[PDB]
Amino acid sequence: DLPVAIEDILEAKKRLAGKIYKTGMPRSNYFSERCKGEIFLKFENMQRTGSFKIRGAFNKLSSLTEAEKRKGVVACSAGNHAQGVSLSCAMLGIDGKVVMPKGAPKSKVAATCDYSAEVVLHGDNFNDTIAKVSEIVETEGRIFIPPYDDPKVIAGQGTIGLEIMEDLYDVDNVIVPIGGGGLIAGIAIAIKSINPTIKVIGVQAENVHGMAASYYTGEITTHRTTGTLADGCDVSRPGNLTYEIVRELVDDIVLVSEDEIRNSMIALIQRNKVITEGAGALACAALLSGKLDSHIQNRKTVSIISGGNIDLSRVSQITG
Amino acid sequence: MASHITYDLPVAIEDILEAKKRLAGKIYKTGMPRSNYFSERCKGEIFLKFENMQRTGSFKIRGAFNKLSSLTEAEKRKGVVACSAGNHAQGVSLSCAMLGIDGKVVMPKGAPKSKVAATCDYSAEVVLHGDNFNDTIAKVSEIVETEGRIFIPPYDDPKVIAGQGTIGLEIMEDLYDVDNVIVPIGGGGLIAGIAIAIKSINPTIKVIGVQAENVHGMAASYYTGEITTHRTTGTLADGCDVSRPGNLTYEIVRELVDDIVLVSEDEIRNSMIALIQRNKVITEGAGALACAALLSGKLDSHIQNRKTVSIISGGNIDLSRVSQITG
Ligand code: NA
């Protein structure tokens, strides 16, 4: 019934072969001690471009036909998706345009430019960039690259699930952050197809959690009050495909506070020597919050460190 | 090679296997992923061994724990003593806590406040004394004579070397087809342990050491044929600021270490920046030495189209210093 299947993920594994490589997943001393169970950290912060998003973007772009590639590609993002698309464009020789707001974090702009794609600065908000993307699609015929709501993107993300089970046969739980739901949807399909006894559990911020609201509600729903330290997961409404998949496969979704995200970031950097952005600390925030204690005690749990694209100045600011 | 080592060197594979047994269920294997950035730069497969993520933030828990756990109950009751301004202090202090052993650690006045704090938080009594290492050694000597405590050497000890060597076993478990292992050197305990483990299992693997240009007693000794002191000045790689190598470690290194290369302060800094910004891990200067050698071009003949492990030996550096280097 689902719009993505295990075969799509195995196709992605084939496309990524020799181009995108497996990230580390070591046991954590600190988290294992705190949580009274074995906690493993999946280092997607050490994936190319500093987050997992290269996987889905590279799978989508590589899966394009020659004629589709020649049309050029377009995206809108002021962070991790921008970088994933840009590098994929360089790796594949595809012509790319990435739209951002008029004045977005300078670290992310030069990184996106350095990765090859043309950056177009436009608008005072994300709505305005989508509008500009809409113009670029209509006027230039470029192919839009969705950040989550696309079967190839979901399939790319799912390669992470394969790696997890390759490295740790007897895993009990996989804890995953959610924005639009591509990461968890992909991982869920991979994990549940191979071993459905493994629990797949999502995490979002209290301040903004469209997917969680949808999950609780039983239909696609919007939820946002304000932004979050987990800015990569600041998504008010989930994808159509990703919600469909999450509704069926995900075992639960928990919410964590801004303080819990902060604490998790501090633990990861201070006690695990791992640089994470807010969204990359969400899963570990859930672990430290106590909300997963019944699942994790005396068991084996993988926590996704989804990204590390944050300035050290910002890390210092948050640590205090 | 295993037999040659066992007969002719002061530490051998058996000692490393004993250490594995003492550490089992207490000290766990650290990650060793492939690095995108370093593999791209080096035109070969580079893997990073994350001892920065070991208990206490460096590998030094391994040797300390093995040494302390190896003591008889009578020896443990005498209490122990060490001197260090950082990683060794933390390793000894935690080991004492884990084993219920009474420990006294002498640190120089003006050792970083986070490091002194970290050593106090575990268990051991911290004695602040002197403005240099020699001063803390002098106080240790007083404590040993007056209190009868057992001194815990930071490298020049068979049990410490053997504990360090468990890293070698993990490398071979995770990457049996590794070609090279690149290891920082201060006193030589880390590399001596690793070399014994690696060369005993597959002697075709190259084990190469790295030290700072600014201070490299082990390198000087290796190139001259006798124990020799070298120190020009301090270094970013403070964990490897050791002007004269150990006796046991020099003996092992001269037999089993293929080469020792030197890196500049700029090279260390560049490597720290790469690890932090491109690999998202916190490393201290000494933890970046092996990667500095790799980026320097000084290992280029060994690393293309091959599998190379780089030891990230420690992560005990203040966020302010990291933030300064990055910023
Ligand atoms: Na040599």
Curated annotation (Swiss-Prot), chain A:
Which reaction is recorded as catalysed by this protein?
Answer: L-threonine = 2-oxobutanoate + NH4(+); L-serine = pyruvate + NH4(+)
Query: Which biological pathway?
Result: Amino-acid degradation; L-threonine degradation via propanoate pathway; propanoate from L-threonine: step 1/4
State the InterPro entries in the record. Answer: Ser/Thr_Dehydratase, Ser/Thr_deHydtase_PyrdxlP-BS, Thr_deHydtase_catblc, TrpB-like_PALP, TrpB-like_PALP_sf
This protein's UniProt keywords: Allosteric enzyme, Lyase, Nucleotide-binding, Pyridoxal phosphate
Names of the cofactor(s): pyridoxal 5'-phosphate
Name a Pfam family for this protein. PALP
Any one Gene Ontology MF annotation carried by this entry is: L-serine ammonia-lyase activity
So which residues are the signal peptide here?
A: none
The subunit structure is:
In the native structure, TdcB is in a dimeric form, whereas in the TdcB-AMP complex, it exists in a tetrameric form (dimer of dimers).
Family listed = Belongs to the serine/threonine dehydratase family.
Function, as annotated, reads: Catalyzes the anaerobic formation of alpha-ketobutyrate and ammonia from threonine in a two-step reaction. The first step involved a dehydration of threonine and a production of enamine intermediates (aminocrotonate), which tautomerizes to its imine form (iminobutyrate). Both intermediates are unstable and short-lived. The second step is the nonenzymatic hydrolysis of the enamine/imine intermediates to form 2-ketobutyrate and free ammonia. In the low water environment of the cell, the second step is accelerated by RidA.
Name listed for the protein in its UniProt record: L-threonine dehydratase catabolic TdcB
Q: What is the originating organism of this protein?
A: Salmonella typhimurium (strain LT2 / SGSC1412 / ATCC 700720)
Q: Source organism lineage?
A: Bacteria, Pseudomonadati, Pseudomonadota, Gammaproteobacteria, Enterobacterales
Q: Which gene encodes it?
A: tdcB
